[PDB]
Amino acid sequence: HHPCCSNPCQNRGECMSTGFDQYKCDCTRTGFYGENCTTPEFLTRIKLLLKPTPNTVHYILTHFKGVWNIVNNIPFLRSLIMKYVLTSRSYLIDSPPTYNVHYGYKSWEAFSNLSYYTRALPPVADDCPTPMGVKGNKELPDSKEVLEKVLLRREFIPDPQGSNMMFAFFAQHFTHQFFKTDHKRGPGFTRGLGHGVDLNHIYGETLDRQHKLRLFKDGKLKYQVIGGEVYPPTVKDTQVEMIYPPHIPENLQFAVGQEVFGLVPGLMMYATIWLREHNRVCDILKQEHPEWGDEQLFQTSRLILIGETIKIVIEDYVQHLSGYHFKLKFDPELLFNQQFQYQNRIASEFNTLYHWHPLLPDTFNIEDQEYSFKQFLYNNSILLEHGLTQFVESFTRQIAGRVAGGRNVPIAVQAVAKASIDQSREMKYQSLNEYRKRFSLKPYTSFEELTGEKEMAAELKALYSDIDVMELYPALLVEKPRPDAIFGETMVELGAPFSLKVLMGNPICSPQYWKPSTFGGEVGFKIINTASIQSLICNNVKGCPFTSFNV
Amino acid sequence: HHPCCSNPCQNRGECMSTGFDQYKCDCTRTGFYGENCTTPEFLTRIKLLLKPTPNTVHYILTHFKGVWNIVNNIPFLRSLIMKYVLTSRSYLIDSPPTYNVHYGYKSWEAFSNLSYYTRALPPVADDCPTPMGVKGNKELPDSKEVLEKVLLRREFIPDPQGSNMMFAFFAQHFTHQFFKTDHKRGPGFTRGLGHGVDLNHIYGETLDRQHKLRLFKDGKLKYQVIGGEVYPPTVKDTQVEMIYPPHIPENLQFAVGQEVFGLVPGLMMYATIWLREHNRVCDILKQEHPEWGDEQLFQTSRLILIGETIKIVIEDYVQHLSGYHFKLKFDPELLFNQQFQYQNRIASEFNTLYHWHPLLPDTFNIEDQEYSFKQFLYNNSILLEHGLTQFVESFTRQIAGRVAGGRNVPIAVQAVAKASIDQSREMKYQSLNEYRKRFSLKPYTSFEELTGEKEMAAELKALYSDIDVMELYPALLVEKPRPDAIFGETMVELGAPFSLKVLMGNPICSPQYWKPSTFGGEVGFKIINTASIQSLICNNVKGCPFTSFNVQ
Ligand code: COH
Ligand code: COH
Ligand SMILES: *[C@@H]1O[C@H](CO)[C@@H](O[C@@H]2O[C@H](CO)[C@@H](O[C@H]3O[C@H](CO)[C@@H](O)[C@H](O)[C@@H]3O)[C@H](O)[C@H]2NC(C)=O)[C@H](O)[C@H]1NC(C)=O
Ligand SMILES: *[C@@H]1O[C@@H](CO)[C@@H](O[C@@H]2O[C@H](CO)[C@@H](O)[C@H](O)[C@H]2NC(C)=O)[C@H](O)[C@H]1NC(C)=O
Ligand SMILES: *[C@@H]1O[C@H](CO)[C@@H](O[C@@H]2O[C@H](CO)[C@@H](O)[C@H](O)[C@H]2NC(C)=O)[C@H](O)[C@H]1NC(C)=O
Ligand SMILES: *[C@@H]1O[C@H](CO)[C@@H](O[C@H]2O[C@H](CO)[C@@H](O)[C@H](O)[C@H]2NC(C)=O)[C@H](O)[C@H]1NC(C)=O
Ligand SMILES: CCCCC/C=C\C/C=C\C/C=C\C/C=C\CCCC(=O)O
Ligand SMILES: CCCCC/C=C\C/C=C\C/C=C\C/C=C\CCCC(=O)O
Ligand SMILES: CCCCCCCCO[C@@H]1O[C@H](CO)[C@@H](O)[C@H](O)[C@H]1O
Ligand SMILES: *[C@@H]1O[C@H](CO)[C@@H](O)[C@H](O)[C@H]1NC(C)=O
Ligand SMILES: *[C@@H]1O[C@H](CO)[C@@H](O)[C@H](O)[C@H]1NC(C)=O
């Protein structure tokens, strides 16, 4: 078997076979040396002595509200701390990217082929004696048993952070532009070749699909008007392919950028909002530039909406998630004197960790009605009956489920959660503790340490035997959460650096793009820099209802 | 017409219309402000005082040979100088890229669509009253008149820097991996979707093509043996599509990564050498890793060959072109403490400036024979007849043509030169003086200043009228060369930053790639770090004939 199966190289040293049963570690720029890259250089000893743990940093950011209250209102200081927040994560992501499902060593194929998700950790080699390398039993526990014992919801567990359905559907809508698995190829492949925030979920992945969705007047997207309200156009009108069951009526076959978005009325709610926003921005730019044609209006509006998205994701979405008293800021300028790569490749593990199905409620509560999953799925007549205003009011008020802490995946999506485990295995993911080490975290020494709890820990010990073969995905959903928080340590520490890259590693954040002229002048630029989840709804939803990501 | 037609914004300020009749300049981070970004900030004044001209720096670098001799032998000073050479060029190239033939403004389409060549300057808008914007006559001079008067070879003008045919064909072979115009789409479109040094010209652009070229044993590429010599395999054998005239016999239809390489025996020479080199590196890796499979052997050899290519281009190829006494150095580590984007998009203007057709001789002199263009083209029999040893020996000895200085385009390729002019116009290129300013050069104030001479300048004056509408491509070929040099100032000042980006922007130069383990350990890493044009020939050509890029 492959001599690197045990993952002998530590501290991000790279393992290479040197014969049939010998390995060498490449410790270049790790700050360590020796056979396994475990002897620290003098400077590295000093660095390690002083470095505070993630949990300590979290505590500081979630306390001393008085101090942060001052920090937030002193612009120079807010900038200083945001600048640090951005650059502290920076070293953790390989960019240019490296491994993928088929390549556990660097290759031109892995670098150049955009159809793959990239990999934060190489796959376990094919001939390793054990699923995780050399540790644990001959096979991992039955995935159905893991699912049923520690993942499935008994009673609904609400998010103590107060995340609502507006938040849950925004997460789904936003991430599904870059997590778009190519199932005809396999779980390690993506259909999102842009690898980030390009808004293909609004405009289409291909030029052909974009042209079918566009009006070709005033830069606008096509739309229909039903009961005086603007919605996306039909499949019949646009000839845009969408996924719908056979029974869905013609006018309810909405055509939008992302082909799966007719599945959930929550997704169609945001699809409709963003379409209206694009056309709203077209109206503004046409006012600013009566000389511009349709093409420039369309392209400039798209850049502006990409900006709005990044702005909202940092200052509202991530802000909500963080639980910090410090106000996060979207400001590309903070990176202009720093080393940073304006590019991104979507990692498979970033997709995996974002399978936040415990967010989903037992029912979807709009106005007076409480819809089951069966009633809610593929049913856009619900969107039309209640209207967008009521959707916003209802979903703002409805609480989402806690993600970490165990036993909160609703049974209606049990097949999705099992698939997450099965596909992880199929893609030969290394263990939880390897991912923890990869992201500068201390490996868990027991199952009770992981869960902070006794009962689930015991079920997991009987299933997995060794803590060093616990799998990544189920661990994120059973993990001991931060105090009164939606996530545990592992979710945030992996999720944060992937998020920074997908947001800031957009070309619009680069110095040659981050200019007023890029967005049609100061008027366009200001739309980006004042965007919020509240203004998105206020500008595009009748009655301007109050909204936020918290109940 | 478009309010920005006159290119009013200076110093890399961006122009946008603000109504039918009005424009606004975006002066962000230019160091200038005002209506046209021409009023310098105080720090910019100080910078513009202590900034030497390109001609001054070229003079320093090509003189004081005794000082450079010492400097070259102090590894610390050499690293320092090379770090400066790298970083001084840096700021001139938009990365991530911006404009293309269809987008004179930044757009997601222009950023994301890899089928386009990018543009260092946006195209002149379609409704502009004049081809160059507002200056000059309603129509540019007839390109045939420009070609015949100032570009066509009367007698052969040898390169005073001593460039040989090894250099000329290396330039053609190397560059045609990333200059690969998509003629079905148009001159502003490319088939090189990798936008750089990926060696698709050896391995194929697509996975399907690559697999048909591969042996699937020991990481190797398929080959054939003719009279005991290793050549690329045939089209019949591989089923790999190649461009050949119908009269070419099946046995002479060589199949390589790049579709067009069968058309010049000088290209097939380098194709054969690199194929051999790949298989040589496979043998070395197999010896180091008896545990490795075919797939890893092939991939790791490809990465080593990419490293070798960049190494040779910097330390032999650019070294020669430069005429510098300072020894340039390939060392990705020099950039690890600097701001630099490990990515590249090929600019249309980089393709245009690289149309070095004056390099070509009147005849191709191999051994005792002098082959005409008609005789040399599509004729791989010449390669088989003479062999690689004699190709290398003959091409090392044969001088190439001077590129700058005028009237040196071979008549046999006149249609190609005219095409360069015509396609520039079709792609709506801005003027020579706009490109000079874009790259921090003083605009020329007359045709005589451009050429350094009187007779061609007068021809150009009567053709174009105004120096500010002189076109980029013919200007490159008539420009006054640096003393005893192959090129003038514009070629080098545009060419150098583009070359830095295509060489250093490659992912293999990034911190996470630039490690021994990427290349199969220390032995693989060392192949890259000791590669040269001479070692490439020595390892892969029978007899190890002496070679270099100059005649001497
Ligand atoms: C971020 C939170 C989130 C939410 C709230 C959410 C809400 C819901 C929801 C009800 C509203 C339903 C019925 C589902 C059902 C599914 N989800 Co999500 N999903 C979410 C995150 C994801 C992600 C990420 C993927 C992977 C996408 C991919 O790889 O293509 C996913 C994949 C799926 C898949 C398989 C993808 C495929 O094969 O096409 C199904 C089925 N699901 N989910
Ligand atoms: C760099 C030096 C160099 C050399 C030595 C060289 C040597 C030779 C050569 C040798 C006998 C022949 C027969 C040709 C002939 C041609 N060359 Co070059 N070429 C060179 C650089 C280029 C470049 C760059 C292009 C554009 C390639 C593209 O965009 O596809 C080119 C294009 C061409 C074309 C297509 C022109 C068009 O209509 O657009 C022909 C034909 N040629 N060239
Ligand atoms: C990126 O990587 C993908 C995975 O390797 C690759 O998809 C694969 O492509 C190969 C060759 O194109 C397909 O093989 C097919 O074609 C050959 C040639 O005739 C046949 O011998 C095979 O039987 C088969 O039909 C694979 O099927 C395919 N693998 C998939 C779909 O998972 C992509 O081509 C790569 N993308 C790029 C742009 O290079
Ligand atoms: C802005 O830059 C240019 C715009 O091209 C300049 O406008 C020109 O000024 C020329 C000489 O001063 C005149 O020939 C002409 O009046 C004018 N050209 C056009 C087309 O209007 C402006 O002077 C300059 N403004 C500033 C503030 O320097
Ligand atoms: C990149 O841009 C080119 C040019 O617009 C695209 O090619 C066109 O695609 C359209 C729409 O599908 C076709 O109708 C035309 O045949 C193409 N025009 C040409 C060849 O000039 C190309 O599709 C784009 N690439 C991507 C990935 O979107
Ligand atoms: C590097 O790691 C290897 C492999 O893990 C180490 O080998 C040993 O590790 C422990 C050392 O006390 C032993 O308990 C293991 O049995 C043994 N494992 C194997 C496979 O040999 C090796 O000691 C490490 N080297 C250094 C310098 O620490
Ligand atoms: C779009 C993905 C957002 C969620 C990612 C998954 C889990 C939680 C990650 C981040 C939220 C909590 C803390 C991160 C806060 C600051 C660091 C990242 C800043 C940024 O990112 O600029
Ligand atoms: C890709 C190779 C292209 C060759 C260059 C093209 C045109 C002339 C430009 C440079 C050759 C002459 C001098 C080079 C001087 C400095 C460049 C060093 C940076 C680099 O380039 O490392
Ligand atoms: C929707 C939940 C159905 C789970 C069915 C499988 C039950 C086996 O799982 C068991 O569930 C018990 C009930 O919570 C727990 O107390 C045990 O620890 C657990 O092992
Ligand atoms: C769809 O929603 C409507 C309410 O708008 C509801 O009455 C109906 O039962 C739903 N359809 C299905 C098939 O569940
Ligand atoms: C091809 O090359 C041979 C030399 O090997 C030469 O004799 C012959 O004339 C050439 N063919 C053509 C088409 O000129």
UniProtKB/Swiss-Prot annotation, chain B:
Mind listing the UniProt keywords for this protein, alphabetically? Answer: Acetylation, Dioxygenase, Disulfide bond, Endoplasmic reticulum, Fatty acid biosynthesis, Fatty acid metabolism, Glycoprotein, Heme, Iron, Lipid biosynthesis, Lipid metabolism, Membrane, Metal-binding, Microsome, Nucleus, Oxidoreductase, Peroxidase, Prostaglandin biosynthesis, Prostaglandin metabolism, S-nitrosylation, Signal
| InterPro entries (UniProt xref) | EGF-like_dom (IPR000742), Haem_peroxidase_animal (IPR019791), Haem_peroxidase_sf (IPR010255), Haem_peroxidase_sf_animal (IPR037120), Oxylipin_biosynth_metab (IPR050783)
Task: Name the residues that bind heme b.
Answer: H357
Cofactor stoichiometry and binding remark: Binds 1 heme b (iron(II)-protoporphyrin IX) group per subunit.
The conditions that induce or repress this protein are given as: By cytokines and mitogens.
Give an example GO biological process: regulation of cell population proliferation
Q: In which pathway does it act?
A: Lipid metabolism; prostaglandin biosynthesis
List the residue(s) that the UniProt entry marks as the site Aspirin-acetylated serine.
S499
Effect annotated for changing H357Y: Impairs peroxidase and cyclooxygenase activities toward 2-arachidonoyl glycerol
Q: What is noted besides the main data?
A: The conversion of arachidonate to prostaglandin H2 is a 2 step reaction: a cyclooxygenase (COX) reaction which converts arachidonate to prostaglandin G2 (PGG2) and a peroxidase reaction in which PGG2 is reduced to prostaglandin H2 (PGH2). The cyclooxygenase reaction occurs in a hydrophobic channel in the core of the enzyme. The peroxidase reaction occurs at a heme-containing active site located near the protein surface. The nonsteroidal anti-inflammatory drugs (NSAIDs) binding site corresponds to the cyclooxygenase active site. Conversion of arachidonate to prostaglandin H2 is mediated by 2 different isozymes: the constitutive PTGS1 and the inducible PTGS2. PTGS1 is expressed constitutively and generally produces prostanoids acutely in response to hormonal stimuli to fine-tune physiological processes requiring instantaneous, continuous regulation (e.g. hemostasis). PTGS2 is inducible and typically produces prostanoids that mediate responses to physiological stresses such as infection and inflammation.
Entries under PANTHER family matching the protein: PROSTAGLANDIN G/H SYNTHASE, PROSTAGLANDIN G_H SYNTHASE 2
The UniProt entry's sequence similarity note says:
Belongs to the prostaglandin G/H synthase family.
Q: What is this protein called?
A: Prostaglandin G/H synthase 2
Organism field: Mus musculus (Mouse)
